């Protein structure tokens, strides 16, 4: 029958932004000093809008704020080196949005002279300058995804032995039915796909994850499939809060055993940038005969041209 | 010699969005039912990005959150009617950004079914439906400004007798000299004008304010001139934090007594919408012989065409 | 067989501080200015309160609202609280837990002392009725004075269950003392495992373990209150009103009674984190325990006098 | 004429609780395991504490300890006891006295709740540690409190070492308004400078109390160095005297050299940590210049209540 492995190969013509995992890989191989300078240059070169509000994150930022410049620079080398320190382990314990807010606060303090700057006239190594040109050449959604993915990977491995208790964020209540937008997708009336996108746009992660088969999977961009409603809901709650999915176009094809493959293309806006960064996205669904989601992949596309790439099975 | 009044008339061909103060006046005329309905349609029709995290505003938001729907509505009517109640007096005490964050939280709660909705089947009064239509046609910058000035004037007069102690926000440290961007303006090299714009983009209001005469004046769009370095400093700290001024063009003209008048056009972005709303702005400066600002007007322009009307 | 009403009459001679409800009743029939003047005399003639609840966001914001008001508007809010007027502030106050209401008034008293909140007017004279109340309070013992002040400020603002009430605020549930670090009480005259289990659980804030000692339809009757029936309601009361209580029982009698039930009376003192070892309240616990050792009924009484700690009359 | 040096010897009979610095010193010679065991055994006979480290830096570092596995929590406490150079120890050093005490209070409450690692089961005090515990068990209440306070305040790093972190500041409490102040009454004494000092301190009016000192006047707290000059005295009062209640009972006034007066007062001090539970037995020894300004005041924790009656004139 159908497996997660076979579902991953649906719509083979979908062109993803492989510049993202390429640059994240190159980035990760630089020394601490290059990584930090790249983060500063990448950040500065780029319209962000903001949480590290929570008491643990706020207090560790206050610890950094009271340190002399030399001790602040050491904390940042430790995060970029993935060193074993309590600050690195606490950073590992942070949810994605707290990691992002943590870095955003350090960037603001650097610009205010509160946190040690990159050393004036600092010289990017050859490999680092290459990485920065790679980032400059990428589109807006690719640039944000490289920055996000790079800072997320800093500090210690969060599942290594002796890991600290993972921080919990409040579940934001969903938009009430009466106030939800309903998407229209040119060429698609599939109730499961419309249900998924409408529930996600409402932050209704309970209703979105209920559409999944108990052993179904969600594959985020450039990640492994996340299997089962418990782990999918956890991913949605941590990584999909306030995403706005603006689907444009789709194709639906019956496949073997009464399953249906549906491809949708459109834009996703993140609360981090609002209407200033539309990420070019594809959703690839495999839907079972009962209308349960067996698989969905979210792909960051190479360019806006890929929004028009809806090729039927040959 | 110049006065604030005579300074106000510099660059007379400048076309300001009088739709904004118009629609704002219609809005103020409406009953509370129609005012709340319009706010809600505006907040739904329009990509906002954010505050009222401060203890007073947070606790008052929690008070509204625990009320039944009927008492929540009554509070919101009291704000629209500018009634004399502790909640209205506290709201009047808030800074501009706390008032905006307060209303933003109520709109998020209404969308989540935590705060009473506008009744399905509530129908706008005729006038209200006109006011709403007038807003839909106006451009983004003008819509944001209507929405801003409407909610800022809710609750009580902040300077009335019996007013509550005004709340204060933390003064944000300016951008450090090394990390500041310097603007270029086609057709302009005035050091005072460039110094004002660069200091404001760094949130360095002490440096911007030092560019004015003792009794120098700043006139925000559709407002009374603010007179004196202390009142200007107070206004910049409350209303200009995180504004990004993106001038494109300007003209300079010598006038009487060795004064200079300079008009600059371009865009301003606000942190509330970031790069998603560039408001269309002119700055009109009257500069004294020693290079001190006597007067500067900030004007919200009729349309993107006024960006070219320097003449 | 036993009912809540029959259980209420166990150990008939237990003499209770009836001056508390008397004085609480009289306090509330005074006008607002007298009520405020009397509270101010208490906070001053009793400045050994060790603390605060009201740190929580709602209570902190409403305090900041009162802080920014002019003296005339602050006095008006306190009159509204004393008059139990229908206002958002009085409805919010009504929604507070006991400890938040007490911390709220505590902050207002400190702010009055600091010149931040409008004081009782210079040389205010208590009406004759108010001087009678102050006199009764003065004649009452420490444990009784603490209860009158507590029960008086709790009853201010609006009826918390009136139509149009605001959602009740919730306090974080404090984790219990772990078993290895608990004190066990020893009570002279008593080895009843249920009674000891109850007192040790409460002194550890283990309200889940205390409530599990009750029958489904078991009741807890706090001083001068209606019985609270069932494990949900009793747990909600313990969480709100028993946090950090120290029960120092001294002596008890146990008696077998009809149907294989045992009745147990215990006397002792209770300390509250508001006053610590300062104020020991003279308390009797009256327990009716079923044949399985589950609690059917327990009354907590504030006793009329310290004599009552020896009144353990059997029959 | 008078020096801080000669002032220190006024009222030579006055017997102080020398057991306090004895035990503090003994305690600090023990290894980290004995130190933590003793803190727990001492704090366990002291649940009549009635209370802070509310402030964002302290709360976040407490949340950091709370999320740590037991092994890591114990290592942080060994670092504090060993005065190791770690960011946590440097932050701890930066704290005010009351934040240091609130920090240790939170860890004690967490230990009692099973949230922080206990003293290992069966743990056995070294011979020297059992000698320290015995001395603590024998000390009166005021002396036990003082030993615990001074012990925990001296943990973490040297707050004035090279590489120190920015000192945290606490909010200054508004004083009691004059209409609501108490006036003390002292048997034997109507000295307006002594009464003015005590009444001002009881109102938290540190500015008025400091204005009673000579420019180069000194305040000598129990078992500490003399604090010299109005700015230093004001900083000390703001940090360590908030909410103290002085209850002087008896005193003697003697005219001495150079137009000076010396005044000895005995009575009690209550602390907001303990309230009316613990009244510590205190003497105040004032040297007052001819203009009525304090040249020197020592506050002594007395050896026994018998010292309350040691008021002899010569």
Short mmCIF file of C-alpha atoms in Angstrom, two decimals, chain B residues 55-60 62-68 70-71 75 86-91 93-94 162-167, chain C residues 57-62 64-70 73 77 87-93 95-96 164-169:
data_model
loop_
_atom_site.label_atom_id
_atom_site.label_comp_id
_atom_site.label_asym_id
_atom_site.label_seq_id
_atom_site.Cartn_x
_atom_site.Cartn_y
_atom_site.Cartn_z
CA UNK B 55 1.12 46.87 34.28
CA UNK B 56 -1.71 49.50 34.25
CA UNK B 57 -2.86 48.74 30.65
CA UNK B 58 -2.37 44.93 31.10
CA UNK B 59 -4.50 44.88 34.29
CA UNK B 60 -7.29 46.99 32.68
CA UNK B 62 -7.57 41.69 32.18
CA UNK B 63 -10.52 43.56 33.81
CA UNK B 64 -12.30 43.74 30.39
CA UNK B 65 -11.39 40.04 29.74
CA UNK B 66 -13.18 38.80 32.92
CA UNK B 67 -16.37 40.89 32.25
CA UNK B 68 -19.45 39.33 30.59
CA UNK B 70 -22.68 42.98 27.89
CA UNK B 71 -20.29 44.78 30.37
CA UNK B 75 -16.89 49.77 28.48
CA UNK B 86 -12.11 55.44 35.71
CA UNK B 87 -11.45 53.19 32.64
CA UNK B 88 -11.90 56.25 30.32
CA UNK B 89 -9.67 58.47 32.55
CA UNK B 90 -6.99 55.68 32.71
CA UNK B 91 -7.20 55.25 28.90
CA UNK B 93 -3.58 58.75 30.76
CA UNK B 94 -2.01 56.21 28.30
CA UNK B 162 -9.66 65.43 37.42
CA UNK B 163 -7.20 63.78 34.93
CA UNK B 164 -5.09 60.79 36.11
CA UNK B 165 -1.24 60.89 36.25
CA UNK B 166 0.05 60.29 32.68
CA UNK B 167 1.89 56.97 32.19
CA UNK C 57 -1.79 41.22 36.76
CA UNK C 58 -5.49 42.14 37.25
CA UNK C 59 -4.99 43.23 40.92
CA UNK C 60 -1.67 45.01 40.13
CA UNK C 61 -3.31 46.97 37.26
CA UNK C 62 -6.34 48.05 39.38
CA UNK C 64 -1.94 51.21 39.55
CA UNK C 65 -5.31 52.70 38.44
CA UNK C 66 -6.00 53.80 42.04
CA UNK C 67 -2.37 55.04 42.37
CA UNK C 68 -2.69 57.44 39.37
CA UNK C 69 -6.11 58.88 40.49
CA UNK C 70 -6.34 62.22 42.38
CA UNK C 73 -11.27 59.79 42.98
CA UNK C 77 -13.32 54.12 44.92
CA UNK C 87 -18.93 49.38 39.55
CA UNK C 88 -16.29 47.58 37.43
CA UNK C 89 -13.76 48.04 40.31
CA UNK C 90 -16.23 46.50 42.90
CA UNK C 91 -17.09 43.63 40.49
CA UNK C 92 -13.34 43.01 39.86
CA UNK C 93 -12.70 43.14 43.65
CA UNK C 95 -13.81 38.24 41.65
CA UNK C 96 -10.51 38.26 43.66
CA UNK C 164 -23.41 39.77 35.87
CA UNK C 165 -20.45 38.68 38.08
CA UNK C 166 -16.92 38.77 36.52
CA UNK C 167 -14.93 35.55 35.99
CA UNK C 168 -13.29 34.51 39.29
CA UNK C 169 -9.48 34.95 39.33
#
